[PDB]
Design a protein around this ligand. Sequence first.
Ligand SMILES: CNC(=O)C[C@@H](NC(=O)[C@@H](CCc1ccccc1)NC(=O)c1c(C)noc1-c1snnc1C)c1ccc(C(F)(F)F)cc1
Ligand SMILES: [Cl-]
Ligand SMILES: [Cl-]
Length: 264
Amino acid sequence: KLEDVVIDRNLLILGKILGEGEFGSVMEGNLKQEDGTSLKVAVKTMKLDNSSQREIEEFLSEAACMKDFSHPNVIRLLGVCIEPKPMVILPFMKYGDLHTYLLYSRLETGPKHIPLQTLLKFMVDIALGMEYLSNRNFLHRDLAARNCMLRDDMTVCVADFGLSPVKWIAIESLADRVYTSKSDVWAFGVTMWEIATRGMTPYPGVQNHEMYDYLLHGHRLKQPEDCLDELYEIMYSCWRTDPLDRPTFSVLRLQLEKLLESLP
Ligand SMILES: CNC(=O)C[C@@H](NC(=O)[C@@H](CCc1ccccc1)NC(=O)c1c(C)noc1-c1snnc1C)c1ccc(C(F)(F)F)cc1
Ligand SMILES: [Cl-]
Ligand SMILES: [Cl-]
């Protein structure tokens, strides 16, 4: 398990901090590869509960499982490093996260106004990434626009740069410890709304502490102004009270492809 993913620490050069949290940090870095070239990397350092070997074993098991994953809409895991501090090595993406990109697109110096066709392709990319993980019974647990990364060819891939998200958490997950693929589907619906609104924080006028009661009374994210009824119908189906009534990522992906293909 260790031998399959662990990269020698002297092959990694650490740079500046990109982001910092309570249980981790994201840093820019250089990784010397097998072919003798150096690749630009994003290094996610994680604080593990070292009071038992349960977290390090579960960490290495997930890393060994991820190494074998290969999909264009899922971030590629290059390997891991141990300084007992584990480090996740991922490719560095100059276009950054999708949430920041959507916000820059609304400003003059940032990318040009994103058309509807491009917004929907961002969604199809995430759905394709999530369909791949859902098929291998892998739970994301932190799906949001901030965790979706833009590759150099402008394709979107799913990642987890979280360093610890009440407004993305499924109603059943707020009531109980319960978290399934249908909870990732709820978070996807919220991720879609973030894209459609070009980076708005979910539920304007609603506090984080009011969220459970707000959802319990049947209220959901409102339809955005420039949003097609067919698109809002897809994101709303992600927020059905009973998780069983929510569509699979496979169904969601095809609905989005069919809707994207019907546009000029
Ligand atoms: C608990 N597990 C989660 O909560 C899922 C979550 N994992 C983590 O946050 C952490 C979890 C580390 C851990 C701590 C204690 C016990 C066990 C494990 N593991 C990575 O950071 C990671 C690893 C180990 N190997 O690769 C990546 C990452 S992080 N971003 N992309 C990759 C591939 C995750 C990872 C990857 C994705 C994806 F989009 F597919 F890339 C989505 C969600
Ligand atoms: Cl905003
Ligand atoms: Cl709303």
